[PDB]
Amino acid sequence: MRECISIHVGQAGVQIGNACWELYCLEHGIQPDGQMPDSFNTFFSETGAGKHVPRAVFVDLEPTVIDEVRTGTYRQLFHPEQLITGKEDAANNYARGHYTIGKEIIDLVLDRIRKLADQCTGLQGFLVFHSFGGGTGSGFTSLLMERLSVDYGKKSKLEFSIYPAPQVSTAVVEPYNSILTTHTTLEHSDCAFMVDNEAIYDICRRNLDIERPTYTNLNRLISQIVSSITASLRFDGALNVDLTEFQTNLVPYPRIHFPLATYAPVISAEKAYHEQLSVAEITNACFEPANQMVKCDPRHGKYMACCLLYRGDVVPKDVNAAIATIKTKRSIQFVDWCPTGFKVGINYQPPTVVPVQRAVCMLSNTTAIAEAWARLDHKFDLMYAKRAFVHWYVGEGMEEGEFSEAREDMAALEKDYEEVGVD
Amino acid sequence: MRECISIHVGQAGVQIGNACWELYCLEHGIQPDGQMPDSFNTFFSETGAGKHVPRAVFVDLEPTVIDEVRTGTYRQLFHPEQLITGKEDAANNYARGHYTIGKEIIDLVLDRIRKLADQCTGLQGFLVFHSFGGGTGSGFTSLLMERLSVDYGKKSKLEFSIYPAPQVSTAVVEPYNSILTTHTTLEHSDCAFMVDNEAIYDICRRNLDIERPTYTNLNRLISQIVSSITASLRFDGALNVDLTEFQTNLVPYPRIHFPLATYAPVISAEKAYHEQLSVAEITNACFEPANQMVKCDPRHGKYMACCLLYRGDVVPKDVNAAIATIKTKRSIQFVDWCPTGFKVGINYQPPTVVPVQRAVCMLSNTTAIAEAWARLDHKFDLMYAKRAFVHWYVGEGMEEGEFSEAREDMAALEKDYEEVGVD
Amino acid sequence: MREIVHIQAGQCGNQIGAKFWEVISDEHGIDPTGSYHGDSDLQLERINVYYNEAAGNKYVPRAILVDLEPGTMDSVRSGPFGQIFRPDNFVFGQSGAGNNWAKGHYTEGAELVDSVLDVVRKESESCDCLQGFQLTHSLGGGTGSGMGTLLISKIREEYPDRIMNTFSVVPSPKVSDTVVEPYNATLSVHQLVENTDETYCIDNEALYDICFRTLKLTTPTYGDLNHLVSATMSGVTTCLRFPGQLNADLRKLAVNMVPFPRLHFFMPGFAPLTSRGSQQYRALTVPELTQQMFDAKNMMAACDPRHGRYLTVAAVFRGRMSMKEVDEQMLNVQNKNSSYFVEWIPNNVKTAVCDIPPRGLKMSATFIGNSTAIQELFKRISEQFTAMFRRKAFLHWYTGEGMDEMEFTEAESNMNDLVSEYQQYQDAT
Ligand SMILES: Nc1nc2c(ncn2[C@@H]2O[C@H](COP(=O)(O)CP(=O)(O)OP(=O)(O)O)[C@@H](O)[C@H]2O)c(=O)[nH]1
Ligand SMILES: Nc1nc2c(ncn2[C@@H]2O[C@H](COP(=O)(O)OP(=O)(O)OP(=O)(O)O)[C@@H](O)[C@H]2O)c(=O)[nH]1
Ligand SMILES: Nc1nc2c(ncn2[C@@H]2O[C@H](COP(=O)(O)OP(=O)(O)OP(=O)(O)O)[C@@H](O)[C@H]2O)c(=O)[nH]1
Ligand SMILES: [Mg+2]
Ligand SMILES: [Mg+2]
Ligand SMILES: [Mg+2]
């Protein structure tokens, strides 16, 4: 009766969704053919025959990666009216994804939403797997979110996004993407989510015993996070926290909606022993700086709000002693005027494995993330100091002052976390 | 409920620990796989599954001897987050272990302590198996002990160390190690322990019928001592003496904390007969000078305090007559103003064998050990009279007067035992 | 979709394409006839971009061959991969340009251009979606100089959005095979700086060097001279023709690299390179493929990166590979050669990873570089121009075709406008 649809924008989001719906089919026992040999209306719908289809929309301006789903192993799962392709990519040009090509096939993707919104009645959240690296994953992202608040307005819109890395940075105009996309995702998205590529590597290198990771394995870490956020809807625990509450819990002021995800425990197969993984043991590893997936030191700021989504085998009194430890420390410290800073969620379902006992997803809306914007503002100034690459965005119809209008917009964003940090 | 963790510093301490935890697994019936087909929380902890792990931390700056554990027979016993290796050794340079390389991986080893200190609640002592011969076993030893009194301060810190030999001496700058390490282990260690290599040989040669010993067999003698010191915690005798009492019993003044270990009876297999090994027979062999493991004649000074840790099969009245003999002799004599100079400990557990009825560990804080420092001060003067090897410690960042500051520090150490000897 | 139309010119550039389409033949399993024999079905999934699938199990090279004398067209059609082309597309003159730019651009350039611009129109109409046009020619001869440059100005009048790349060989630094090589460079410089989106620039002498330094060859033929550019051109679009862990195409390479439209003159780079037997005694992995690129000797344009400053860096890999093995190597090498780059770009290393290797070795990489080292070659070329111009020699040919000094002078000034702008950002930091 309760639903939560998903949209995938750009090439980086599709390869996230290739591992996500790989995991969801293994959750409810679904085959790649939509077949299984109760309450799962959030991510699936039933046909007239005994087949289930995903509530997913795959958009791309280049026809490459969607053919990898249209010819891959997960081929028969998807409705061919969902698989939407373009012809010419934005090709790491935000003005092409926002003005040139994305304005043409915008009619088809938005029409597929209401075709999914017929059978949905408990519409409780949206999923937009979009990166800020590629132009298609960013230029279409701004055009998509404008119509939905015109469409729904009151319904929830969540973005499990990918943060551009401060050191290991692939493309060139990746600093140009973030400042331009700021005005959309601060005025439409109810709670955006930042994940950096860079912190994943040492988790793969040290904690997962494989120094040289693959992008197939980078998606496996985030796919476990997205499932355990939905662990209250898809199942039944003693304390089920639905997605309406998170945007009401984690948001003290309606502009501040940038937490970070933290999955724990992250172990290897050989290190599955030499440990016991009690509920007090693993939550201290959550607040370890080298276990999070965002390159931000949590002891460089203060926590505004914290959330903990447990699964597996959990007794709350045993967690009650675990939370009592973290308030009674000193290197871990909160925003002082928020003394009630925990949101606990327990599900009695084990964390499934993709080819352990319990697992924790930590969601901490903190002030440690605010330094990451300043590391990216420093990138954007010098490339705009030369007026470099202006003839591509202006070459694809964009105002020069539209950079400058969004330039001060980050300063009003940055002064928020500075103001909340002091008493 | 009561715990006692162990740390191994340098190459010589690891090969001690290779035979120690070999013995502990044979005590409680533990396999090398942490498996066994009650109260042993002192040296072990239980996983979620039925496996137990040792409370041991192996540090080394060279990767050689730790690979001998990482590939040896005792491979699966150890948590791979405990097995800590470096890259470049101190290589018999104390200034490299104290300034150059040991300052880098100091963060990892100290972090493993609090990860062990979670499950510990009756933290009653530390074990640091460090030699004074190698630079890594001495240079890391000073850096390690400074943080722990900042960490704990009140908790017990014990060092089962290896004394450098006055005649059979391997390296060259071994006199340089002892004077530099003096200021740390006299200001942090609650009760240090000296064991010389040289007295072990004649015990192996005469009393053990093998004139040519191996370093595998040298570790077997000290490993029996370390177990019977813990014989009150790990088991139940009629007079259990815990490790809090020893540092309160054996220490009349808080600088004097240098006793010596004496294991007895030390017999061979063919000499297991032609004897009866009564409790009065073997304790006279304890005060024999050729049965101790420190090259110091006990009839060249006076005893300040004595301790006797029995195991096997012991009746205290039968020991009461045995102790009455030793006070009623003349060649064995005490410090006269300490007339109550015995600490007795009985455990009803037999001394286990590594591939008899009773065993005695003797701990005698005496003034006979004070001549061993003067034999090593005589080595250190002439090598510093030439100003030899100054360009390595100064070549690795060390003050010349830091030798001279520690030079008079041994004189204040040496005048302690001289002052207590007279009435 | 996004098909690509191929145009040739000159006499050097045809023999390169006479080897380049042999490279594309075995990168798609294409026989010398025109049929198909490959086994991997990833070839047929994107076969359309360089080939029209003609009627009845056929595949024809979507290519336009242009000469001005029937010799080189006869040599292609008689040798290998000549019957694979369409006989309708052998569009060639009868005179020969006479090694004159003005003959290829004014008198004889106006004749055959109408025959070409229908064939360009016939392919561009037949293509479902059009990506861009590519040209392989000379800058030293007559047909490669005038005839190719006359086309591109007519194409910019047609298509504003379609990309354009010329794999034009730079006139030679020290050897002088062409007597009038400034007069075929400078009059060709002005067309390239106006309306070519990206422009590939290869020195002759470094191609002799790379065939002699790393490989240690004794008798290098043009089948092995020009073969290195043939693998180079294939590595530009190898992320288009096959899927990857990070795909790329000709528009992604353009907007990432070119910082301002007057600075788009690039340099290649290819790895690995061995001998016939000295091929296994080396750890041919990512760090070897890392450090093989960034040295001065791997650049097919003879220029020292130490005597200059980069602006942007692209890198296209081939074959299956991990990422932190690549990424840290693609990050740390910016710090050891730190002062050689420029200040105002953070992380100027563009990475591109396909998932299909060449038919051969397991992994391969294609380097696309941009630096200020190339402008120092033009000061030689401007000196080579003015040495033959301060006496005003060789003018009566161009006077016989009809041209003032100002067209020579402003193009030399526009050559100096290239000088005044690559020096400008080099002086800045
Ligand atoms: N790397 C190569 N350079 C070549 C080759 N053939 C010629 N060249 C160079 O190209 C220049 C000559 O240009 P072309 O071969 O294209 C002569 P083209 O048909 O363009 O015009 P004409 O002078 O009217 O014959 C000159 O600098 C030669 O050194 C070749 O196979 N490889
Ligand atoms: N989460 C995730 N991000 C990835 C992965 N591979 C690449 N990325 C990121 O995606 C960025 C590129 O974005 P893409 O989605 O591939 O490109 P696009 O949105 O389609 O836009 P254009 O292709 O330029 O038109 C890279 O810079 C990386 O930061 C992956 O497997 N997972
Ligand atoms: N107790 C004991 N001591 C040993 C044994 N083998 C050697 N030693 C002593 O160890 C001293 C050398 O110390 P090491 O621990 O090996 O060296 P290190 O501290 O790792 O520093 P390096 O100089 O880098 O090797 C020798 O001089 C011996 O006195 C052994 O089996 N048992
Ligand atoms: Mg893409
Ligand atoms: Mg050693
Ligand atoms: Mg020619």
CATH number of the structural domain spanning residue C287: 3.30.1330.20
Distance of CA A396 to the CA centre of its chain: 29
For residues C271 and C413, state if they share a domain.
Answer: no
For residues B67 and B179, state if they share a domain.
Answer: yes
Put simply, the chain C residues between 292 and 321 with a CB less than 8 A from any chain A CB are 312
Which residues of chain A does C350 touch, with a Cβ-Cβ cutoff of 8 Å?
170-172
Are B177 and B138 contacting, i.e. CB atoms less than 8 angstroms apart? Answer: yes
String of b and e for A128-155 (b: at least 16 CB within 10 Å)?
bbbbbbbbbbbbbbbbbbeebeeeeeee
In angstroms, the CA A162 to CA B68 distance is 43
In angstroms, the CA B384 to CA B390 distance is 8
Separation of C379 CA from ligand 3 center, angstroms?
A: 68
Residue A290 DSSP symbol: T
Q: Which position has the token pair 């890391």?
A: B140
Of all protein residues, the one whose alpha carbon is nearest to atom 3 of ligand 1 is C12
Q: Which residues pair with A83 in a beta bridge?
A: A58
Rounded to 5 degrees, what are φ and ψ at C315?
A: -150, 125
Work out the burial of residue C189: count CB atoms within 10 Å of its CB; fewer than 13 is exposed, 13-18 middle, 19 or more buried.
buried
Are B161 and B194 contacting, i.e. CB atoms less than 8 angstroms apart? Answer: yes
Lookup: tokens for B121 = 């609640």
For residues C13 and C160, state if they share a domain.
Answer: yes
Beta-carbon separation of A170 and C257 below 8 A: no
Are B255 and B413 contacting, i.e. CB atoms less than 8 angstroms apart? Answer: yes
For residues B297 and B205, state if they share a domain.
Answer: no
Beta-carbon separation of A88 and C256 below 8 A: no
For residues C379 and C339, state if they share a domain.
Answer: no
Are C406 and C414 contacting, i.e. CB atoms less than 8 angstroms apart? Answer: no
- How near does any CA of chain C get to the CA of A86, in Å? 10
Query: For residue B205, which amino acid is it?
Result: R
Q: What secondary structure, in 3-state letters, does chain C show?
A: CCEEEEEECCCHHHHHHHHHHHHHHHCCCECCCCCECCCCCHHHHCHHHCEECCCCCCCEECEEEEECCHHHHHHHHHCCCCCCCCCCCEEECCCCCCCCHHHHHHHCHHHHHHHHHHHHHHHHHHCCCEEEEEEECCCCCCHHHHHHHHHHHHHHHHCCCCEEEEEEECCCCCCCCCCCHHHHHHHHHHHHHHHCCEEEEECHHHHHHHHHHCCCCCCCCHHHHCHHHHHHHHHHCCCCCCCEEECCCHHHHHHHHCCCCCCCEEEEEEECCCCCCCCCCCCCCHHHHHHCCCCHHHCCCCCCHHHCCEEEEEEEEECCCCCHHHHCHHHHHHHHCCCCCCCCCCCCEEEEEECCCCCCCCCEEEEEEEECCCHHHHHHHHHHHHHCCCCCCCHHHHHHHCCCHHHHHHHHHHHHHHHHHHHHHHHCC
Q: What is the dihedral of CA B230, B236, B240, B242, to 10 degrees?
A: 40
Distances (CA, A) of A127 to A9, A144, A287: 10, 12, 26
Q: Which atom of ligand 3 is nearest to the CA of B174?
A: 27
For residues C234 and C351, state if they share a domain.
Answer: no
Distances (CA, A) of A270 to A151, B80, B236: 50, 9, 37
Beta-carbon separation of A92 and C343 below 8 A: no
For residues B161 and B209, state if they share a domain.
Answer: yes
Residue B155: other Cβ atoms inside 10 A = 14
Query: B222: Cβ–Cβ under 8 A, 6 or more apart, which residues?
Result: B16, B160, B195, B261, B293
For residues C67 and C89, state if they share a domain.
Answer: yes
> Which chains share 3+ C-beta pairs under 8 angstroms with A?
B, C
Q: Which position has the token pair 């008198």?
A: C107
Of all protein residues, the one whose alpha carbon is nearest to atom 5 of ligand 2 is A12
In angstroms, the CA C400 to CA B169 distance is 100
> Roughly how many angstroms between the first and final C-alpha of chain A, as a whole number?
44
In angstroms, the CA B323 to CA B362 distance is 13
Greatest Cα pair distance in chain B? 62
Which residues sit directly before a break in chain B (C to N > 2.5 Å)? Answer: 37, 355
For residues C410 and C304, state if they share a domain.
Answer: no
Rounded to 5 degrees, what are φ and ψ at B116?
A: -85, -30
Plot region of A209 (φ>0 → left; ψ -120 to 50 → alpha; else → beta):
left
Identify the CA nearest to A260 among candidates A155, A339, A371: A371
User: Using alpha carbons only, what angle is made at residue B79 by residues B78 and B81, rounded to the nearest 5 degrees?
Assistant: 135
For residues A301 and A384, state if they share a domain.
Answer: no
Are B313 and B358 contacting, i.e. CB atoms less than 8 angstroms apart? Answer: yes
CATH code, domain with A384: 1.10.287.600
Point out the annotated binding site of B: 10-12, 15, 62, 90, 131, 134-137, 170, 174, 197, 215, 219, 243
Are B29 and B37 contacting, i.e. CB atoms less than 8 angstroms apart? Answer: yes
Point out the annotated binding site of B for Mg(2+): 62
Query: A253: Cβ–Cβ under 8 A, 6 or more apart, which residues?
Result: A416, A420
In angstroms, the CA C269 to CA C301 distance is 9
Whether ligand 2 lies within 6 angstroms of the CB of A134 is answered as: yes
Q: Which of C341, C357, C373 is the last residue of a domain?
A: C373
For residues B145 and B218, state if they share a domain.
Answer: yes
Plot region of B389 (φ>0 → left; ψ -120 to 50 → alpha; else → beta):
left
Can you state the percent helix, strand and coil of chain B, rounding each to 5? 40, 15, 45
Beta-carbon separation of B47 and A275 below 8 A: yes
Can you state the percent helix, strand and coil of chain A, rounding each to 5? 40, 15, 45
Distances (CA, A) of C366 to C247, C257, C271, C354: 14, 15, 7, 11
For residues A322 and A400, state if they share a domain.
Answer: no
Query: For residue A93, which amino acid is it?
Result: N
Rounded to 5 degrees, what are φ and ψ at A127?
A: -125, 120
In angstroms, the CA A349 to CA A345 distance is 12
For residues C369 and C300, state if they share a domain.
Answer: yes
Give the mutation candidate from B81, B84, B85 for the A interface (greatest A CB count, under 10 A): B81
For residues C86 and C100, state if they share a domain.
Answer: yes
Domain with C398 in it: 374-429
* Bridge pairing between strands A44-46 and A52-54: antiparallel
Q: What secondary structure, in 3-state letters, does B184-223 show?
A: HHCCCCCEEEECECHHHHHHHHHHCCCCCCCHHHHHHHHH
In angstroms, the CA C399 to CA C405 distance is 9
Residue A272 DSSP symbol: G
Are C411 and C189 contacting, i.e. CB atoms less than 8 angstroms apart? Answer: yes
CATH code, domain with B274: 3.30.1330.20
Plot region of C300 (φ>0 → left; ψ -120 to 50 → alpha; else → beta):
alpha
- What is the DSSP track for A363-412? EEEESTTHHHHHHHHHHHHHHHHTTTTHHHHGGGS--HHHHHHHHHHHHH
| DSSP SS3 for A332 | coil
For residues C79 and C163, state if they share a domain.
Answer: yes
Which residues of chain C does A212 touch, with a Cβ-Cβ cutoff of 8 Å?
322-325
Q: Which residues pair with B334 in a beta bridge?
A: B303
In angstroms, the CA A317 to CA B412 distance is 56
Cis peptide before B355 (omega within 30 of 0): no
DSSP E strand stretches across B72-214: 122-130, 158-160, 191-193
Lookup: tokens for A32 = 């790649």
Q: Which of C373, C392, C408 is the last residue of a domain?
A: C373
User: Using alpha carbons only, what angle is made at residue B64 by residues B61 and B67, rounded to the nearest 5 degrees?
Assistant: 110
Query: For residue A323, which amino acid is it?
Result: I
For residues B322 and B375, state if they share a domain.
Answer: no
Identify the CA nearest to C109 among candidates C146, C141, C71, C152: C146
Alpha helix segments (H runs only) across B273-399: 279-286, 316-327, 370-385, 390-393
Residue B276: other Cβ atoms inside 10 A = 8
Q: Which of C334, C353, C373 is the last residue of a domain?
A: C373
Which residues of chain C does A213 touch, with a Cβ-Cβ cutoff of 8 Å?
322-324
Beta-carbon separation of B47 and A284 below 8 A: no
Which residues of chain B does A273 touch, with a Cβ-Cβ cutoff of 8 Å?
34, 47, 49, 51
CATH code, domain with C411: 1.10.287.600
Q: At what angle do helices B10-27 and B215-229 cross, to 10 degrees?
A: 60
Task: Please tell me the experimental approach by which this structure was elucidated.
Answer: cryo-EM
Residue A325: other Cβ atoms inside 10 A = 13
Q: Which of A200, A226, A259 is the last residue of a domain?
A: A259
Are C201 and C185 contacting, i.e. CB atoms less than 8 angstroms apart? Answer: no
Residue B261 DSSP symbol: E
Q: Which of B259, B291, B310 is the last residue of a domain?
A: B259
Lookup: tokens for B333 = 């004599």
Rounded to 5 degrees, what are φ and ψ at A306?
A: -135, 145
For residues A212 and A190, state if they share a domain.
Answer: yes
> Which chains share 3+ C-beta pairs under 8 angstroms with C?
A
In angstroms, the CA A32 to CA A73 distance is 7
- How near does any CA of chain A get to the CA of C238, in Å? 13
Are B262 and B364 contacting, i.e. CB atoms less than 8 angstroms apart? Answer: yes
In angstroms, the CA A309 to CA B298 distance is 66
Are B53 and B5 contacting, i.e. CB atoms less than 8 angstroms apart? Answer: no
Residue A299 DSSP symbol: G
For residues A210 and A303, state if they share a domain.
Answer: no
Identify the CA nearest to B171 among candidates B103, B223, B94: B94
For residues A360 and A216, state if they share a domain.
Answer: no
| DSSP SS3 for A154 | coil
Identify the CA nearest to C227 among candidates C18, C81, C30: C18
In angstroms, the CA B373 to CA B370 distance is 6
Rounded to 5 degrees, what are φ and ψ at B392?
A: -100, -45
Rounded to 5 degrees, what are φ and ψ at C410?
A: -70, -35
Total domains in chain B come to 3
Lay out the sheet containing C90-92: strands in order across. C90-92, C63-67, C3-8, C130-136, C163-169, C198-202, C265-271, C364-371, C310-318, C349-354, C244-246
In angstroms, the CA C105 to CA C154 distance is 12
String of b and e for C122-150 (b: at least 16 CB within 10 Å)?
ebbeebeebbbbbbbbbbbbbbbbbbbbb
Residue A45 DSSP symbol: E
Domain with A357 in it: 260-368
Give the mutation candidate from C46, C47, C263, C324 for the A interface (greatest A CB count, under 10 A): C324
Total domains in chain C come to 3
String of b and e for B95-118 (b: at least 16 CB within 10 Å)?
bbbbbbbbeebbeebeebbeebbe
Query: For residue C221, which amino acid is it?
Result: T
Are A4 and A127 contacting, i.e. CB atoms less than 8 angstroms apart? Answer: yes
Residues of B noted as catalytic: 245
What sign for the dihedral angle of Cα A294, A170, C351, A23? positive
- How near does any CA of chain B get to the CA of A362, in Å? 20
In angstroms, the CA B359 to CA B261 distance is 13
Are A43 and A124 contacting, i.e. CB atoms less than 8 angstroms apart? Answer: no
Lay out the sheet containing B359-366: strands in order across. B261-264, B359-366, B303-311, B343-347
Separation of B135 CA from ligand 5 center, angstroms?
A: 7
Are A370 and A338 contacting, i.e. CB atoms less than 8 angstroms apart? Answer: no
CATH code, domain with C208: 3.40.50.1440
For residues C67 and C54, state if they share a domain.
Answer: yes
C314 → chain A, closest CA residue: A171
Identify the CA nearest to A21 among candidates A5, A37, A3: A5
String of b and e for C12-43 (b: at least 16 CB within 10 Å)?
bbbbbbbbbbbbbbebbbbeeebebeeeeeeb
> Which chains share 3+ C-beta pairs under 8 angstroms with B?
A
In angstroms, the CA A268 to CA A213 distance is 14
CATH code, domain with B122: 3.40.50.1440
Q: Which residues pair with C51 in a beta bridge?
A: C61
For residues A210 and A326, state if they share a domain.
Answer: no
Query: A333: Cβ–Cβ under 8 A, 6 or more apart, which residues?
Result: A302, A303
Are A311 and A351 contacting, i.e. CB atoms less than 8 angstroms apart? Answer: yes
Are B351 and B359 contacting, i.e. CB atoms less than 8 angstroms apart? Answer: yes
Rg (CA), chain A: 21
Identify the CA nearest to A134 among candidates C247, C367, C318: C247
For residues A314 and A252, state if they share a domain.
Answer: no
On the CB side of A303, CA atoms within 13 Å amount to 23
Are B13 and B137 contacting, i.e. CB atoms less than 8 angstroms apart? Answer: yes
Give the residue numbers in A contacting B (CB under 8 Å), as ranges: 270-271, 273-278, 280-281, 284, 357
Residues of A noted as catalytic: 245
In angstroms, the CA C81 to CA C51 distance is 14
In angstroms, the CA A194 to CA B338 distance is 71
Residue C67: other Cβ atoms inside 10 A = 28
For residues C395 and C348, state if they share a domain.
Answer: no
Q: What is the dihedral of CA A213, A217, A222, A227, to 10 degrees?
A: -160
Residue B165 DSSP symbol: P
In angstroms, the CA B220 to CA B224 distance is 7
Q: Which of B192, B226, B259 is the last residue of a domain?
A: B259
Residue C72: other Cβ atoms inside 10 A = 20
Which residues of chain A does C255 touch, with a Cβ-Cβ cutoff of 8 Å?
91-93, 173, 389, 392
For residues C152 and C168, state if they share a domain.
Answer: yes
Separation of B292 CA from ligand 3 center, angstroms?
A: 21
